[PDB]
Design a protein around this nucleic acid. Sequence first.
RNA 1: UCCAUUGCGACAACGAGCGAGACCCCGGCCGCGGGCGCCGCGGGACGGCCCGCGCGAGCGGGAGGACGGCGGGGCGAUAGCAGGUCUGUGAUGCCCUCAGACGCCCUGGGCCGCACGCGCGCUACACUGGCGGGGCCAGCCGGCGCCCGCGAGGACGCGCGGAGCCCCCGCCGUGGCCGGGACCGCGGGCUGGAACGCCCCCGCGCACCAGGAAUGUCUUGUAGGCGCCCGCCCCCACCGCG
Lengths: 158, 103, 143, 137, 60, 73, 186
Amino acid sequence: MAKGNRRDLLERNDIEVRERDKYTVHTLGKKKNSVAVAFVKAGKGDILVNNVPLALVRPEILRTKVSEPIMILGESLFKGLDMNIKVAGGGHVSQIYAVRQAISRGVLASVKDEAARSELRAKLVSYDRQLVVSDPRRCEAKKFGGRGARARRQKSYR
Amino acid sequence: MHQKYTIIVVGKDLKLVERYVKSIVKEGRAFGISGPCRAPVRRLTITTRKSPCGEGTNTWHRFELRMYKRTFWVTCGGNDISTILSKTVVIPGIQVTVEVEEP
Amino acid sequence: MTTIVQPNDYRDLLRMFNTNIQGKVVLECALVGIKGIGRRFANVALKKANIDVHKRAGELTAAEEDALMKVLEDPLSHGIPAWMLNRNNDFESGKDMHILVNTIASTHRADLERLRKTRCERGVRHHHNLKVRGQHTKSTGRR
Amino acid sequence: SVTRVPADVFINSFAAHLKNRGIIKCPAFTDYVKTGVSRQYAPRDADWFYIKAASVIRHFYISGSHSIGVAGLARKYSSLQKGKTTPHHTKRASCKVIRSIVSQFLGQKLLIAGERGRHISPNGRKMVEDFAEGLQK
Amino acid sequence: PEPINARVIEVLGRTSSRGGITQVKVEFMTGEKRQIIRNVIGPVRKDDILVLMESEREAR
Amino acid sequence: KVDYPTLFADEAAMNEALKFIKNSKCITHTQICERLRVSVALAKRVMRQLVKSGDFAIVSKSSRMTIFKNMTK
Amino acid sequence: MSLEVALFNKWPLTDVKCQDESLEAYISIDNHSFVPHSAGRWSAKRFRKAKCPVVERLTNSLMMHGRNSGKKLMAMKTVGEAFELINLYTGKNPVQVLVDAVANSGPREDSCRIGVRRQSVDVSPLRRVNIGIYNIATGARKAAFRKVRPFAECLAEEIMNAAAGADKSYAISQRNSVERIAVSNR
RNA sequence: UCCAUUGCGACAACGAGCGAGACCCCGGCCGCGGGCGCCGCGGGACGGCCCGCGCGAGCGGGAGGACGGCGGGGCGAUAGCAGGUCUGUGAUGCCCUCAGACGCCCUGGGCCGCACGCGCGCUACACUGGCGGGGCCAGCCGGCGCCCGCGAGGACGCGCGGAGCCCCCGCCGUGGCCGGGACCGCGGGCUGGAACGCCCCCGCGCACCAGGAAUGUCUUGUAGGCGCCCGCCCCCACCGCG
């Protein structure tokens, strides 16, 4: 239902103010019509999605996909960070991929050191480059000649 | 005195509708008139066959007319009806750039 | 259900209303073979009759069988809604009943006879073999 | 709370408890209903009412101070109508059962009346969270 | 008789109508080093390994 | 063309049906259906009984398919 | 290494290799996501699909016919069940079995009307592996149609029979027929 | 040489122009400003860098980058057709009709009528499935509460709000069967002055076991599958634009 670019979602005004400030880092990730917003604060370590524990997100079979940014690296740094992700857009899979992208970008920023940041960048991008850089391709239009983007209505030459 | 008045600008052309606001904000330099909310564009759409008789390959015209609009409800009662007229005179005269004031 | 070995009373081939039901299919759907009895009127009928609807047809027993017979001839006297009967109303009785295989032939037949004598439009299209409802016949269903 | 446990277990356990405690009591018209024009046949299970009620109460708890209309819940139980030699079209569920369920809940003060519709009363939130923690272990 | 696998070297381009077939100048990386010719279907590129069932065949 | 009983009359349900598998390690409702020459639901119920007995265990349960193993061998 | 990408979290991917040198570098059996899914736009290049994980290719062909076009998660589940069955029967790591099945299939000679006096030409490795995959998928699909047994059982049976080299399999039969008819035209 | 009379280099030719390009709308990255509602102004990508060639324009490979080599649309040259349109118009020449009217209006009927031939489509022939319960996310954009009724619908009162596929648990078990829903019989409602129009319920349950000669369309968010809004509209979408 949510567009993804609403001012409310982008600024995460849903959270109460006194807890809004404690989140410092801001991150973003998207795939196709899906926008995921992540706020980070250092802590004992934990993740959330749309007010849900990270484990119990229901593509089920894609749990490893939502958690790849973690098991790729060590849990050492993920231990000291806590996230409150909020996602909205089109399709379960798109939301999944956007979420993992946001996780990667957010963890990358919080390192606070540029050299180790570059080292993590090299490690992560070696694996699936589309964990940091976004995916560009997007749905295209349809022309009146046919009933699809490229397909045309069947023609009878006789 | 104070009226919680509103300013609304409605038009089709992006050029004038964007230049006119700049003059308005100039005129409201000291009366506190501030940023305008820019509403989503109301892209009206119409389609029609290009052939009056419907011969040949079926083709379609696609005309659309957008309706940009901006709102300067900032004044509210911050200004008096005395210079609300002054608000409406120093502004430039654009041929088509409809506007209306309500409290 | 919860049955592996067959009942000692297992009736392998049931019979009712001149129709025979094989005793290896689930109960609710096997009864559908009766003309005038579908699913909706099945699961409702049994339940009012205190019968398990997921047990094989071969496992029921006379007492259950006859109990189902009763609700199946005088149903309105058992709570079933009046909007559920196949014949929601009758022309001469003026009441609401449910008719079955034995007397479902004389329900479109005698209906037709009424149409004929009155010389209605609907009856004529039934005699020359034409569609009855507003239907295009220029190119539809060519024989 | 509830949000850290999947809906599959929570719904069934709360349904069993709701039947045991005698909170909701299935009426007579639960014998011969199809639950929505979209469907074709009737529910196979013998206690669908209580599952439905538990899903509804969870829905109300998740919505917080927002208010949900009887029809608003009916669009979340919509299905697809098939068997018509034409493209399938979506349809809404039934509203009478939902109405009876909310009436039964409100008669127990677990559901406060708002300006439009209703929302979860504080004691209802208490109960939902209590069962959630009780089954969390 | 045994089909011996070949190492590809230099490709002389398509040599057919409708495309599809491509020419090649393979050689035996089995230590033989016999720069012979052969014809190949589908995509192909340098360093490709091919299994010839005719140890001795020609085309041009 | 092929007709399968939905329940064993007697004996069949222990002399063999509960024994043919015993001389097996892996199985599935369809494997036995084609093997034992009977319907599927019978295999489902019988496998329930067997797992309750404890001899047969599960490896990958799902709604569509549930492979079993002969732990007691 | 820092991480060991175990497929489905049950079978290690470390010790796997195809003995055949013909297409060793054309079978990507090193880099595999923990699950067969991936959105990467493989084949955008020309030879890009050469590195795509083999299992992903395998699942991308089980949704061929129009009734199943676009359903990938079902295919992941199907492949999981198939791997359970294969490990159950044979007892060795399924991925090795899959690579053997792909290797044995894949013709080594074909008949084309070069330049119909069809002649016998050799075949590129990539076509070999693609054809092996396609033949396996279609052979499993054919049997399961209008038949009691499920798709996954057919898939497993096909893979075991192929890796066994038995001509009983559909794919091996097809390969033998093609090779022989090509020899006819040499 | 270029997808291109797009370019390099010659020549009784010299010098210009139109079309092509440039151009306008949309989308991907970044910045500023403002902000009820994400919407206004700008940067950025240019065969630019490296390596091969080629005088040459330009071709092949590798990088770095949101994007790499015409990303999708709009515009559309000269000349021409007895192509369509007098039934789109206060656009029209000449004919025909003009007080028993081809003028305008009213009541009915018809344009749907059916032994048959085919053109664009829709539903299926099932286990990669059908039924029941549950969980859940879109965009062009968008209106809701209470109470009766099985449902379609109905009486009130106010401004408030989004789905199929899919995933999970069970039943069915290769039987034209729980696949299929054409056709037909009672009944309950809506629009309208007026049902021949449209919805819902019970019942009956046609062909159809993957379709010959022949033939059509398609290269990335593409085919295919899945659904959702607008158009004409008192009611109705298997259609068309999206």
